[PDB]
Design an enzyme around this catalytic site. Sequence first.
Site, PDB file in Angstrom:
ATOM      1  N   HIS A  61       0.803  -1.222   0.000  1.00 12.47           N
ATOM      2  CA  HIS A  61       0.000   0.000   0.000  1.00 12.47           C
ATOM      3  C   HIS A  61       0.841   1.280   0.000  1.00 12.47           C
ATOM      4  CE1 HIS A  61       0.082  -1.223   4.362  1.00 12.47           C
ATOM      5  NE2 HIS A  61       0.430   0.045   4.499  1.00 12.47           N
ATOM      6  N   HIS A  91       6.567   7.251   5.613  1.00  9.10           N
ATOM      7  CA  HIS A  91       6.014   6.805   4.347  1.00  9.10           C
ATOM      8  C   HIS A  91       5.349   7.990   3.676  1.00  9.10           C
ATOM      9  CE1 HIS A  91       2.713   6.344   7.305  1.00  9.10           C
ATOM     10  NE2 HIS A  91       1.931   6.772   6.331  1.00  9.10           N
ATOM     11  N   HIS A  93       2.099   9.273   0.653  1.00  9.65           N
ATOM     12  CA  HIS A  93       0.827   9.011  -0.004  1.00  9.65           C
ATOM     13  C   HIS A  93       0.957   9.911  -1.224  1.00  9.65           C
ATOM     14  CE1 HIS A  93      -1.144   7.133   3.544  1.00  9.65           C
ATOM     15  NE2 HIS A  93      -0.310   7.899   4.223  1.00  9.65           N
TER      16      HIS A  93
HETATM   17 ZN   LIG Z   1       0.280   7.891   6.107  1.00  5.88          ZN
END
Ligand SMILES: [Zn+2]
Length: 257
Positions: A61, A91, A93
């Site tokens: 993901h 991380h 997005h």
């Molecule tokens: Zn996040």
Amino acid sequence: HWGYGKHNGPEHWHKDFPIAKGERQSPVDIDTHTAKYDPSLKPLSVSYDQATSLRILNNGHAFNVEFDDSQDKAVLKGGPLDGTYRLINFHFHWGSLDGQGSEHTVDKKKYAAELHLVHWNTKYGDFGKAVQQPDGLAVLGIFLKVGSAKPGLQKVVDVLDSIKTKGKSADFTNFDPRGLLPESLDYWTYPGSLTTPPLLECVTWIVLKEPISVSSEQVLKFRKLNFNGEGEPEELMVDNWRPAQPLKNRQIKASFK
Ligand SMILES: [Zn+2]
Ligand SMILES: [Hg+2]
């Protein structure tokens, strides 16, 4: 399992994780005119000089860069926080196009991507315990806009081809997260949740006002990752963001006028 497709995306999450419709879900839209300036908010303290990255992996993901959190090496304190929080991973997005990608929005404005530095409250001993507490986590959110290249991000961009599909990982040592920070530390803060299942409501969000600039070429590399595992049909890893959620009975505070 869950994902970002039309058959398993954000709208379906509530079926396996009822908390999806909770009282303090993230992300949210930040209305700059409604945000309450709070003069009691202390400045943030980010001590990343002793940080130790271990590896980077594609989890299906997103891709996570993990750090050694067995000691107070890279910690976040100050601001709206009580206590010391340890950096465990970071991380991003991102979107399929430059006009979308961020989770939080500012006056409905969406950015190309959003960086999340995840930290857990040390008083709880470990990450697993912290996610059982309403003040267990602190996530530093940073917006990314397309413009000039961010030198400090290149080391991450270059290793991406090594972890193209789900499940792959690679050693990723000596990376300094200080190279991903904007000039100013002014921020907005509000109580929320993790933006991906289990969507636990244990997060004190700290969203920086100033975004960082990355080049078109840098963000393009992100879009070449795969959601699928090796051998399976190729599904590009893009648009791995959750739409804004209802603010409900919450107030967003700003550290600046
Ligand atoms: Zn996040
Ligand atoms: Hg919690």
